[PDB]
C-alpha cells in the first residue's frame, strides 16, 4: 500500500478496496488490523479521507500525464460519479492544488496551461540548442570511434 | 600562432544558430522602444525649439534593428535547417 | 493604353507631373475596366495633388475617383462633397451617389436626365452608364458586409431582385469579380462569407511591414545620397 | 514505425495491434510513460496519444542505410540554405 | 463593467473565460512614437519654407 | 571522470613552438610533451606545459622512448618556479592518436592517476576547437563485449587568464573583431554556424556510410544517441508553431519598421538642415 502511492500510475479505488478492505478494516488473527479504519464513525471518516487521498493522487497523476481527458473518463477512473468528480475537481482548482479548466459544455478537463507564443518559441529554441549540443557530442565521439578503429 | 590565438575568443558554430531568449527579446524591445518614445518627445521639443536626442535616437535604432534582424534571420535559418 | 504599357514613367520626376500621369493612367484603367487599379492610381494622384493650388485638376480627379469608386461598389467619402472648392462641382455627383446608395434607380435616371449631360462635358458619361447598369454590386457588397450567412431568398428580397435564381447569379458573379468574399452552398441556398482569420497570425502584417520598411529605407537612402555638400 | 511526422497514435490501431480492448490502451501507454520509455501525452476527446521519444533502440543495416539517406537529405538542405545565405549576403558579409 | 473577463455565447448558452492578454506595450509605445514623429514632420514642414 | 578541460592560450602557444622547433629540422610525426595545470571540483585547468624528448618507430607501433627522468626534473624545475602547477596530462601534435599512445598514457597515469591527454592539431587551422581531451577508461563494456583500453572523450574549451588575455589581445591588435558584433559580424556568425553544422553533418554521414558498408563495426550504442538527434527535430509547419512564429515575426517586424521610420525621419531632417545651411552659406557669400 505504501509503495502504491509512490508509483506514478492511477490506482483504482474499486480494486484497492477489493484488495485491502478485509486486511485494513476487518483484519484477522494473522493480521492485527489497526483502529484507523475500523467500523467506528471516526473510522468511516478516515476511510472517506483515504478515498479522498486516493482520488487526489490519481488526479495528480492525470494532471502529470493527460492533457485533455473527458469528464466521463475521469469519473470512471476516479470511481466517482460525474457530478462528484466535477465538484472534487472544482474544489481542488479553487484551492490552487492543481491546474485545470473544466469545459463543462463539452465535458473536457483540459490540463495544460495556455501556450503563449513566447514560451512555445522558447521551447523550440531549447530543443534546437539541445539538438546542436548532442550533435556536437556525437561528432566528438564519432571522431573518437574512427580514431581508435584505425 | 595568430590563428590559434584567435581560437581563444572564437564563438562556437552552435552560437551563430542559437536564438536569444524570446521572453527576454520582447522585454528588451519594450524597454528600448519606450526609451525611443522619450527620445522622440525630446527630439520634437528640440527641433521645434530650433529656429542630444538625435544621436541617442540613432543609437537606439541601430540596437533595435540589429537585434530584431539578427533574431528574425536566425529564426528563419533554424526553421529551414531543422525539419 | 498601348503607350503606357510600353513606355515607363520616370519615378524621379515632379510630383505635379506624377499627379497628371497618375490621373491619366487612372482614366485609362477605368475605361479599360481595371477599376480597382484605377481607383488606387487616382487616390495616389489626389494624394500627390499640389495641396491647394490646382482647383480644376483636383475637381476632375475627385469626379473620376468618385465615379470609379461607385463602380467598385464603395461609397466615397462624404467630405469630398462639402469642401468649399468642390461643393458645387461635385453636387451632381452627390446626387448620383445618394441615388445609388438609396438604391432608387428612378432617382438615377432622373439625375441622368437633368445633370447627366454635364457628365458628357466632364467626359464620364460612359462610366455613369456602366454604373447605372452596375448599381446592384453596391447592394451585394453591403449585404456581404452586414450579414455573414444570409440566404439567397433574403438577398433577393433585400436587393429588389425578382427571383432567387437571379440572386444566385448576381452573388456568384460578384464573388468571382473580386467584390465579395462568400460562397453559396447551393445544396440549401445560403451564402456563407469566408470566415475572418486572425490576420496578425498570418503573413499579411509581415508583407505590409516589408513594404513600409522598404519605403523607409529608400527614403533614407535618397536623403543621405545627395547631402549637397558644396566645394 | 511511425513516420516521425504523424507521431500521433489512434486508439483503433493500438487495440488491433496489441489485441487489447480500447479501454486498456490508455492505461498501457500510461504505464509505458511512467516507466520512463515514453514522454508523450494522452488526449481523450480525440483519444490520440501525442508522442515524443527519449528511449532509443538498436539499429540494423537496412535501417542504418535509410537513416543515413535521411541524414544526407538533411545535410543537402543545410548546404543549400548556407549557399543561399552567403550568396544573398555577400556584400554585408565582410 | 470590465469585471471578470469573459464573453457570453447566447447562441448555445455559455460564458467563456480567458486570460486577457496584457496590451503589448511595444505596440502602444510604437503608436506614441508614430504620433511624435508626425509632430516632428509637421515641425519640419514649418521648416523647409526657407528653400 | 572529468567534466571539462579548460586550456589556456599559453599551452597551445608552447606546443606550437615545440612542434615548429622539432619539425624545422627533425621532420617527424606527433611530438610529445607534458601538460600541467590546476584541478577544481571536477574541471581541469591546463595552464603550463613542457616538451619531453620523445622518439618513435613506425614499425611494430611500440618502439618508442619518452624520457622518465626528463619529465621528473622538468616538473622539479616548474614546481620550484610555480608549485601550483600539477601534472595533469600530456599532449601530442599528431592529428590522430597512434596505437602507441596507450603506453604513454599509462606512463602519465603513473604520475597522475586521472591523467588526460590533449591532442593539439598544430598543423591544421580549421573551423575551431584545436584541442581534444581524452581520458583512459577501463570497464567490462556493460553489454558483454571484449574489453580493451579505449580513450573516452572529455569536452574541452579555451579559457584565458587575465595576463594571458591582455597578452593575446595586444598580440592580435590587427584582426580582432568588434565585441559589440553589429549586423555584419552577426550575419557572418550565422554563416559560420551554418558551415559548422554542414561540416558536422557531413562527418556524421561519412561515419554512417562507413558503418553501413562494413568498413566500421556497428557500435550498437551511442549510434542510438545519434538516433536521438534524429528524433529531436522540431517538426516545423505545425499549426500552433506556425501561428506563434508569425506572431513573433510580426512583433519584431513592427519594431524594425518603427526604427526604420525613425531613421528615415532623422535623415530627412538632416537633409533639410544641410540644404538650409548650404543656401545660407551661398547667400551669405554675397
Domain membership of residue F232 as a residue range: 223-282
Give the gyration radius of chain F's Cα atoms: 28
- Cα C34 to Cα A49: distance, rounded to the nearest angstrom: 78
Pairing of strands A66-68, F64-66: unpaired
Cβ distance of E14 and A114 shorter than 8 Å: no
Instruction: Answer yes or no: do F30 and F83 share one domain.
Output: yes
User: Contact at 8 Å (CB) between F7 and F56?
Assistant: no
Q: How many residues does chain F have?
A: 286
Q: DSSP for F68-99, please give it.
A: HHHHHHHHHHHHHH-TT-EEEEEEE--SS--T
Task: Quote the minimal CA–CA distance from C164 to chain F in Å.
Answer: 40
Grid coordinates representing C33 are: 475596366
Look at chain F and report how many structural domains it folds into: 2
Does A117 reach chain E within 8 Å, measured CB to CB?
Answer: no
Instruction: Answer yes or no: do C53 and C135 share one domain.
Output: yes
By the 10 Å C-beta count (0-12 exposed, 13-18 middle, 19+ buried), C114 is classed as exposed
Q: Which residue's entry shows cell 527620445?
A: B39
**Which chain D residue shows the shortest CA-CA distance from B83?**
D74
Instruction: Answer yes or no: do C128 and C213 share one domain.
Output: no
Neighbouring residues of F8: CB distance < 8 A, sequence distance ≥ 6: F45, F46, F47, F48, F158, F159, F160, F161, F164
Instruction: Indicate the SS3 state at residue D20.
Output: coil
DSSP state of B11: P
- Cα F215 to Cα A33: distance, rounded to the nearest angstrom: 68
Does A141 reach chain F within 8 Å, measured CB to CB?
Answer: yes
Q: At what angle do helices B53-81 and F182-213 cross, to 10 degrees?
A: 10
Minimum-distance CB partner of B74 among F16, F127, F190: F190
Give the ranges where A22-116 is alpha helix by DSSP (H).
41-65, 71-78, 82-94
Q: How many residues does chain B have?
A: 83
Kindly list the distances between the CA atom of residue F149 and the CA atoms of F66, F102, F146, F169, F231, in Å, as whole numbers in the listed order.
20, 7, 10, 41, 32
The residues facing F37 across adjacent strands are F46, F86
Resolution value in angstroms: 3.1
Q: Is residue C45 part of a domain?
A: yes
Grid coordinates representing C66 are: 468618385
Instruction: Answer yes or no: do C97 and C209 share one domain.
Output: no
Task: Quote the minimal CA–CA distance from E34 to chain A in Å.
Answer: 26
Cβ distance of F279 and E50 shorter than 8 Å: yes
Does E31 reach chain F within 8 Å, measured CB to CB?
Answer: no
Q: Which of residues 143-182 of F touch D (CB under 8 A)?
A: none
Q: Which of F126, F149, F182 is the last residue of a domain?
A: F182
Q: At what angle do helices F239-285 and C204-226 cross, to 10 degrees?
A: 20
Q: Is residue F146 part of a domain?
A: yes
**Which chain A residue shows the shortest CA-CA distance from D31?**
A9
Positive or negative torsion for Cα C33, C35, C40, C41? positive
Q: Is residue C111 part of a domain?
A: yes
By the 10 Å C-beta count (0-12 exposed, 13-18 middle, 19+ buried), A148 is classed as middle
Q: Which of residues 52-91 of D touch A (CB under 8 A)?
A: none
Kindly list the distances between the CA atom of residue C107 and the CA atoms of A30, C75, C124, C128, F71, in Å, as whole numbers in the listed order.
105, 17, 18, 13, 111
User: What torsion do the CA atoms of A11, A15, A16, A18 make, to the nearest 10 degrees?
Assistant: 180
Nearest to D83, CA basis, from B80, F234, B68, A132: B80
User: Contact at 8 Å (CB) between B5 and F11?
Assistant: no
Instruction: Answer yes or no: do C30 and C139 share one domain.
Output: yes
Minimum-distance CB partner of F97 among A128, A145, A147: A147
Q: Which helix (H) or strand (E) holds F186?
A: helix F182-213
Cβ distance of B65 and F259 shorter than 8 Å: yes
Cβ distance of A131 and B17 shorter than 8 Å: no
User: Contact at 8 Å (CB) between F124 and F16?
Assistant: no
- Cα F169 to Cα F174: distance, rounded to the nearest angstrom: 9
- Cα F194 to Cα D46: distance, rounded to the nearest angstrom: 40
Instruction: Answer yes or no: do C148 and C203 share one domain.
Output: no
Neighbouring residues of F58: CB distance < 8 A, sequence distance ≥ 6: none
Task: Quote the minimal CA–CA distance from F158 to chain A in Å.
Answer: 16
User: Contact at 8 Å (CB) between A144 and F136?
Assistant: no
Task: Quote the minimal CA–CA distance from E20 to chain A in Å.
Answer: 12
Q: Is residue C140 part of a domain?
A: yes
Does F277 reach chain E within 8 Å, measured CB to CB?
Answer: no
Instruction: Answer yes or no: do F178 and F231 share one domain.
Output: no
Q: Which of F124, F150, F182 is the last residue of a domain?
A: F182
Q: Which helix (H) or strand (E) holds C26?
A: helix C15-31
Instruction: Indicate the SS3 state at residue B12.
Output: coil
Instruction: Answer yes or no: do F168 and F243 share one domain.
Output: no
The residues facing F46 across adjacent strands are F7, F37
Angle at A44 between CA A39 and CA A47, to 5 degrees: 115
- Cα D21 to Cα F280: distance, rounded to the nearest angstrom: 92
Q: Is residue C159 part of a domain?
A: no
Q: Is residue C165 part of a domain?
A: no
Cβ distance of E47 and F262 shorter than 8 Å: no
Instruction: Answer yes or no: do C124 and C73 share one domain.
Output: yes
Q: Is residue C167 part of a domain?
A: no
Q: Is residue F211 part of a domain?
A: no
DSSP state of E36: H
Task: Quote the minimal CA–CA distance from C201 to chain F in Å.
Answer: 5
Neighbours of E41 (CB within 10 A): 15
Q: Is residue F121 part of a domain?
A: yes
Q: Is residue F202 part of a domain?
A: no
CA atoms within 13 A on the CB side of F79: 8
Angle at B70 between CA B64 and CA B74, to 5 degrees: 145
DSSP state of E50: T
Pairing of strands F32-38, E6-9: unpaired
User: What torsion do the CA atoms of F258, F263, F265, F271 make, to the nearest 10 degrees?
Assistant: -170
Instruction: Answer yes or no: do C46 and C137 share one domain.
Output: yes
User: Contact at 8 Å (CB) between F30 and F72?
Assistant: no
Instruction: Answer yes or no: do F30 and F107 share one domain.
Output: yes
Q: Is residue F192 part of a domain?
A: no
Domain membership of residue C207 as a residue range: 193-227
Does B37 reach chain F within 8 Å, measured CB to CB?
Answer: no
- Cα A123 to Cα F268: distance, rounded to the nearest angstrom: 42
Instruction: Answer yes or no: do C147 and C39 share one domain.
Output: yes
Q: Which of C128, C152, C176 is the last residue of a domain?
A: C152
Q: What would you measure as the largest C-alpha separation in chain D, in angstroms?
A: 65
Grid coordinates representing F275 are: 540644404
Residue C151: φ, ψ to 5°: -70, 165
Grid coordinates representing D36 are: 520512463
Q: Is residue C7 part of a domain?
A: no
User: Contact at 8 Å (CB) between A86 and A102?
Assistant: yes
Minimum-distance CB partner of B14 among A117, A121, A136: A136
Does B19 reach chain F within 8 Å, measured CB to CB?
Answer: no
Nearest to E7, CA basis, from E26, E20, E25: E20
Cβ distance of A65 and D30 shorter than 8 Å: yes
Q: Can chain E be said to touch chain D, i.e. do they have 3 or more Cβ pairs within 8 angstroms?
A: no
Q: Is residue C58 part of a domain?
A: yes
Q: Which helix (H) or strand (E) holds A1?
A: none
For residue C225, which residues of chain F lie inside 8 Å, CB to CB?
A: none
User: Contact at 8 Å (CB) between A54 and A11?
Assistant: yes
By the 10 Å C-beta count (0-12 exposed, 13-18 middle, 19+ buried), F131 is classed as buried
Q: Which of residues 107-126 of A touch F (CB under 8 A)?
A: 115-118, 120-121, 124
Positive or negative torsion for Cα D26, D27, D32, D35? positive
Does A28 reach chain B within 8 Å, measured CB to CB?
Answer: no
Q: Which of F182, F204, F239 is the last residue of a domain?
A: F182
Q: Is residue F236 part of a domain?
A: yes
For residue B77, which residues of chain D lie inside 8 Å, CB to CB?
A: 81, 85
User: Contact at 8 Å (CB) between B8 and F134?
Assistant: no
Minimum-distance CB partner of D75 among F183, F191, F205: F205
DSSP state of A103: B
Q: Which residue's entry shows cell 591582455?
A: F166
Task: Quote the minimal CA–CA distance from A82 to chain B in Å.
Answer: 40
Cβ distance of B47 and F269 shorter than 8 Å: yes
- Cα F158 to Cα F4: distance, rounded to the nearest angstrom: 11
Minimum-distance CB partner of F194 among D53, D56, D85: D85
DSSP state of A37: T
Q: How many residues does chain D have?
A: 94
Instruction: Answer yes or no: do F42 and F105 share one domain.
Output: yes
Q: Which residues of F touch A (CB under 8 A)?
A: 96-97, 99, 132, 134, 150-153, 155, 197, 200-201, 203-204, 207, 210, 216-217, 219, 222, 225-226, 228-229, 232-234, 240-241, 243-245, 247-248
Neighbouring residues of C94: CB distance < 8 A, sequence distance ≥ 6: C81
Instruction: Indicate the SS3 state at residue D1.
Output: coil
Instruction: Answer yes or no: do C119 and C215 share one domain.
Output: no
For residue F227, which residues of chain D lie inside 8 Å, CB to CB?
A: 56-57, 59, 67
Instruction: Indicate the SS3 state at residue C136.
Output: helix
Coarse DSSP helix, strand, coil percentages of chain E, rounded to the nearest 5 percent: 45, 15, 40
Does E32 reach chain B within 8 Å, measured CB to CB?
Answer: yes
- Cα F121 to Cα A131: distance, rounded to the nearest angstrom: 27
Q: Can chain B be said to touch chain D, i.e. do they have 3 or more Cβ pairs within 8 angstroms?
A: yes
- Cα F87 to Cα F4: distance, rounded to the nearest angstrom: 16
Q: Which residue's entry shows cell 601550483?
A: F84
Q: Which helix (H) or strand (E) holds A25?
A: none
DSSP state of B10: P
For residue B79, which residues of chain F lie inside 8 Å, CB to CB?
A: 236, 245
Cβ distance of F229 and A131 shorter than 8 Å: yes
User: Contact at 8 Å (CB) between F186 and B20?
Assistant: no
Strand segments (E) across E1-51: 6-9, 14-17
Positive or negative torsion for Cα C2, C6, C7, C8? positive
Instruction: Answer yes or no: do F61 and F142 share one domain.
Output: yes
Q: DSSP for B40-64, please give it.
A: HHHHHHHHHT---HHHHHHHHHHHH
Task: Quote the minimal CA–CA distance from F173 to chain B in Å.
Answer: 10
Buried b (16+ CB within 10 A) or exposed e, F35-51: bbbeeeeebbbbbbbbb
Minimum-distance CB partner of F275 among C210, C220, C228: C228
For residue D34, which residues of chain A lie inside 8 Å, CB to CB?
A: 7-9, 65
Q: Is residue F216 part of a domain?
A: no
- Cα F171 to Cα F164: distance, rounded to the nearest angstrom: 10
Instruction: Answer yes or no: do C110 and C46 share one domain.
Output: yes
CA A137 to chain centre: 35
Cβ distance of A9 and D34 shorter than 8 Å: yes
- Cα C56 to Cα F45: distance, rounded to the nearest angstrom: 85
Does B58 reach chain A within 8 Å, measured CB to CB?
Answer: no
Residue F119: φ, ψ to 5°: -80, 125
Neighbouring residues of F286: CB distance < 8 A, sequence distance ≥ 6: none
Q: Which helix (H) or strand (E) holds F132?
A: strand F131-136
Q: Is residue F205 part of a domain?
A: no
Q: Can chain A be said to touch chain D, i.e. do they have 3 or more Cβ pairs within 8 angstroms?
A: yes
Q: DSSP for C157-202, please give it.
A: HHTT-S-HHHHHHHHHHHHHTTS--EEEETTTTEEEEPPPP-GGGS
Task: Quote the minimal CA–CA distance from B62 to chain E in Å.
Answer: 16
Look at chain C and report how many structural domains it folds into: 2
**Which chain E residue shows the shortest CA-CA distance from A116?**
E21
Q: Which residue's entry shows cell 494532471?
A: A63
Buried b (16+ CB within 10 A) or exposed e, C4-40: eeeeeeeeeeeeeebbbbbbebbbbbbeeebbeebbe
Cβ distance of D81 and B83 shorter than 8 Å: no
- Cα A106 to Cα A115: distance, rounded to the nearest angstrom: 21
Cβ distance of E26 and B29 shorter than 8 Å: yes
Interface test with C, best of F271, F275, F282 (most C CBs within 10 A): F271
CA atoms within 13 A on the CB side of D91: 0
Instruction: Answer yes or no: do F23 and F150 share one domain.
Output: yes
Instruction: Answer yes or no: do F149 and F275 share one domain.
Output: no
- Cα D63 to Cα D56: distance, rounded to the nearest angstrom: 13
Cβ distance of D43 and A108 shorter than 8 Å: no
User: Contact at 8 Å (CB) between F60 and F54?
Assistant: no
Q: DSSP for C30-60, please give it.
A: HHTT-HHHHHHHHHHHHHTS-SSS-HHHHHH
Amino acid at each position: 500500500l505504501l509503495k502504491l502511492f509512490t508509483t506514478m500510475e492511477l490506482m483504482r479505488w474499486s480494486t484497492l478496496v477489493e484488495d485491502y478492505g478485509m486486511e485494513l478494516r476487518k483484519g484477522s488473527l494473522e493480521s492485527p488490523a489497526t483502529d484507523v479504519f475500523g467500523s467506528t464513525e471516526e473510522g468511516e471518516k478516515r476511510w472517506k479521507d483515504l478515498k479522498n487521498r486516493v482520488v487526489e493522487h490519481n488526479i495528480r497523476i492525470m494532471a502529470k500525464y493527460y492533457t485533455r481527458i473527458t469528464m466521463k473518463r475521469m469519473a470512471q477512473l476516479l470511481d466517482l460519479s460525474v457530478d462528484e468528480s466535477e465538484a472534487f475537481l472544482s474544489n481542488l482548482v479553487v484551492n490552487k492544488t492543481i491546474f485545470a479548466k473544466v469545459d463543462r459544455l463539452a465535458g473536457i478537463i483540459n490540463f495544460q496551461r495556455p501556450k503563449d507564443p513566447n514560451n512555445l518559441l522558447n521551447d523550440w529554441s531549447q530543443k534546437l540548442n539541445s539538438l546542436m549540443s548532442l550533435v556536437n557530442k556525437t561528432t566528438h565521439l564519432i571522431a573518437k570511434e574512427e580514431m581508435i578503429h584505425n | 600562432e595568430q590563428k590559434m590565438l584567435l581560437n581563444l575568443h572564437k564563438k562556437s558554430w552552435m552560437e551563430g544558430l542559437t536564438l536569444q531568449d524570446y521572453s527576454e527579446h520582447c522585454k528588451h524591445n519594450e524597454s528600448v522602444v519606450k526609451e525611443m518614445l522619450e527620445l522622440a518627445k525630446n527630439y520634437n521639443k528640440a527641433v521645434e525649439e530650433e529656429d542630444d536626442p538625435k544621436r541617442h535616437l540613432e543609437e537606439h535604432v541601430d540596437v533595435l534593428m540589429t537585434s530584431n534582424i539578427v533574431q528574425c534571420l536566425a529564426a528563419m535559418l533554424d526553421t529551414v535547417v531543422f525539419k | 493604353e498601348k503607350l503606357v504599357s510600353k513606355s515607363v514613367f520616370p519615378e524621379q520626376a515632379n510630383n505635379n507631373e506624377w499627379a497628371r500621369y497618375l490621373y491619366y493612367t487612372g482614366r485609362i484603367k477605368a475605361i479599360q475596366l481595371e477599376y480597382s487599379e484605377a481607383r488606387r492610381t487616382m487616390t495616389n494622384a489626389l494624394r500627390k495633388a499640389p495641396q491647394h493650388t490646382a482647383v480644376g485638376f483636383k475637381q476632375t480627379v475627385h469626379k473620376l475617383l468618385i465615379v470609379v469608386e461607385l463602380l467598385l461598389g464603395e461609397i466615397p467619402d462624404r467630405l469630398q462633397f462639402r469642401q468649399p472648392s468642390l461643393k458645387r462641382s461635385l453636387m451632381p455627383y452627390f446626387l448620383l451617389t445618394q441615388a445609388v446608395r438609396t438604391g432608387n434607380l428612378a432617382k438615377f435616371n432622373q439625375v441622368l436626365d437633368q445633370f447627366g449631360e454635364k457628365f458628357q462635358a466632364d467626359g464620364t458619361y460612359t462610366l455613369i452608364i456602366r454604373l447605372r447598369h452596375n448599381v446592384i454590386k453596391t447592394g451585394v457588397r453591403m449585404i456581404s458586409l452586414s450579414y455573414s450567412r444570409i440566404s439567397l431568398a433574403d438577398i433577393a428580397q433585400k436587393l429588389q431582385l425578382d427571383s432567387p435564381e437571379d440572386a444566385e447569379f448576381i452573388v456568384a458573379k460578384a464573388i468571382r469579380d473580386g467584390v465579395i468574399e462568400a460562397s453559396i452552398n447551393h445544396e440549401k441556398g445560403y451564402v456563407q462569407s469566408k470566415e475572418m482569420i486572425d490576420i496578425y497570425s498570418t503573413r499579411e502584417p509581415q508583407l505590409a511591414f516589408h513594404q513600409r520598411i522598404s519605403f523607409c529605407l529608400d527614403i533614407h537612402n535618397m536623403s543621405v545620397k545627395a547631402m549637397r555638400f558644396p566645394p | 514505425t511511425r513516420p516521425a511526422n504523424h507521431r500521433q497514435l489512434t486508439f483503433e490501431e493500438i487495440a488491433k495491434s496489441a489485441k487489447i480492448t480500447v479501454n486498456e490502451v490508455e492505461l498501457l501507454v500510461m504505464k509505458a510513460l511512467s516507466v520512463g520509455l515514453v514522454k508523450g501525452s494522452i488526449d481523450e476527446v480525440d483519444k490520440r496519444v501525442h508522442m515524443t521519444w527519449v528511449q532509443p533502440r538498436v539499429l540494423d543495416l537496412q535501417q542504418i542505410k535509410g537513416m543515413k539517406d535521411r541524414l544526407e537529405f538533411w545535410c543537402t538542405d543545410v548546404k543549400s540554405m548556407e549557399m543561399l545565405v552567403e550568396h544573398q549576403a555577400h556584400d554585408i558579409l565582410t | 463593467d470590465k469585471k471578470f473577463h469573459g464573453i457570453l455565447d447566447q447562441g448555445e448558452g455559455v460564458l467563456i473565460i480567458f486570460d486577457e492578454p496584457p496590451v503589448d506595450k511595444t505596440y502602444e509605445a510604437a503608436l506614441e512614437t508614430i504620433q511624435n514623429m508626425s509632430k516632428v514632420v509637421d515641425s519640419l514642414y514649418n521648416k523647409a519654407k526657407k528653400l | 571522470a572529468v567534466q571539462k578541460v579548460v586550456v589556456h592560450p599559453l599551452v597551445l602557444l608552447s606546443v606550437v613552438d615545440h612542434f615548429n622547433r622539432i619539425g624545422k629540422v627533425g621532420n617527424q610525426k606527433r611530438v610529445v610533451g607534458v601538460l600541467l595545470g590546476s584541478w577544481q571540483k571536477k574541471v581541469l585547468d591546463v595552464s603550463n606545459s613542457f616538451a619531453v624528448p620523445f622518439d618513435e618507430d613506425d614499425k611494430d607501433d611500440s618502439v618508442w622512448f619518452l624520457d622518465h627522468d626528463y619529465l621528473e626534473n622538468m616538473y622539479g624545475m616548474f614546481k620550484k618556479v610555480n608549485a601550483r602547477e600539477r601534472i595533469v596530462g600530456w599532449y601530442h601534435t599528431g592529428p590522430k592518436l597512434h596505437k602507441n599512445d596507450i603506453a604513454i598514457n599509462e606512463l602519465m597515469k603513473r604520475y597522475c592517476p586521472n591523467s588526460v591527454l590533449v591532442i593539439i592539431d598544430v598543423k591544421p587551422k580549421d573551423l575551431g576547437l584545436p584541442t581534444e581531451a581524452y581520458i583512459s577508461v577501463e570497464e567490462v563494456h556493460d553489454d558483454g563485449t571484449p574489453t580493451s583500453k579505449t580513450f573516452e572523450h572529455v569536452t574541452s574549451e579555451i579559457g584565458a587568464e587575465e595576463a594571458e588575455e591582455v597578452g593575446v589581445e595586444h598580440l592580435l591588435r590587427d584582426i580582432k573583431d568588434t565585441t559589440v558584433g553589429t549586423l555584419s559580424q552577426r550575419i557572418t556568425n550565422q554563416v559560420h554556424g551554418l558551415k559548422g553544422l554542414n561540416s558536422k553533418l557531413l562527418d556524421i554521414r561519412s561515419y554512417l556510410e562507413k558503418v553501413a558498408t562494413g568498413k566500421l563495426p556497428i557500435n550498437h550504442q551511442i549510434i542510438y544517441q545519434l538516433q536521438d538527434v534524429f528524433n529531436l527535430l522540431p517538426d516545423v509547419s505545425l499549426q500552433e508553431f506556425v501561428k506563434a512564429f508569425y506572431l513573433k515575426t510580426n512583433d519584431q517586424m513592427v519594431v524594425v519598421y518603427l526604427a526604420s521610420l525613425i531613421r528615415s525621419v532623422v535623415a530627412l531632417h538632416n537633409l533639410i538642415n544641410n540644404k538650409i545651411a548650404n543656401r545660407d552659406a551661398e547667400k551669405k557669400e554675397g
